[PDB]
């Protein structure tokens, strides 16, 4: 009944680690959706400072576009 009390905290520290790595995937998904709405012929900006933000993503940093930019090119190279 001490190890149970330890797991109540270790699980909280694992859910706070799948919160900061699902944010960093939400941001790439929304950046892809922005690029795709811009390509298919719709007038919405694609700067990282103009994405939408909904507490599943947080504020967008610059490095969350670099990451995306090297990941479309990586995916297009593999087709």
């Amino acid at each position: 009944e001490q190890v149970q009390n330890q797991m109540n905290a270790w699980t909280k520290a694992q859910a706070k680690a799948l919160d900061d790595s699902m944010k960093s995937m939400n941001k790439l998904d929304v950046i892809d959706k922005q690029f795709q709405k811009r390509i298919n012929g719709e007038w919405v900006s694609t700067d990282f400072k103009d994405m939408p933000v909904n507490e599943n993503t947080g504020e967008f940093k610059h490095s969350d576009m670099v990451n995306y930019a090297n990941k479309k090119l990586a995916e297009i190279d593999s087709m």
Binding site: W43, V44, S45, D50
Partner: protein
């Protein structure tokens, strides 16, 4: 459930009633830049591409309200 031509009369009220960097004049600014880049590319290469969406869209929004597109971006107006 408003007329499809009465929606412009309000999106444009927002676009007119906006600061210079607000996210309204920054999502339309992409239309202006794509049209401007298209016109420059047309001047240089020589041919006007058969697919020019940005310039046509700016032309429709100009015909919808001329005293707005002439005021915001005063070179596409000319």
């Amino acid at each position: 459930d408003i007329p499809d031509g009465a929606k412009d009369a309000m999106k444009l009220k927002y676009l007119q009633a906006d600061s210079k960097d607000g996210a309204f004049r920054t999502a339309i600014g992409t239309m202006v830049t794509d049209a401007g880049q298209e016109w420059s590319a047309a001047v240089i290469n020589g041919k006007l591409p058969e697919r020019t969406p940005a310039m046509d869209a700016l032309r429709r929004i100009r015909n919808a309200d001329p005293q707005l597109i002439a005021a915001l971006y005063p070179d596409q107006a000319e």
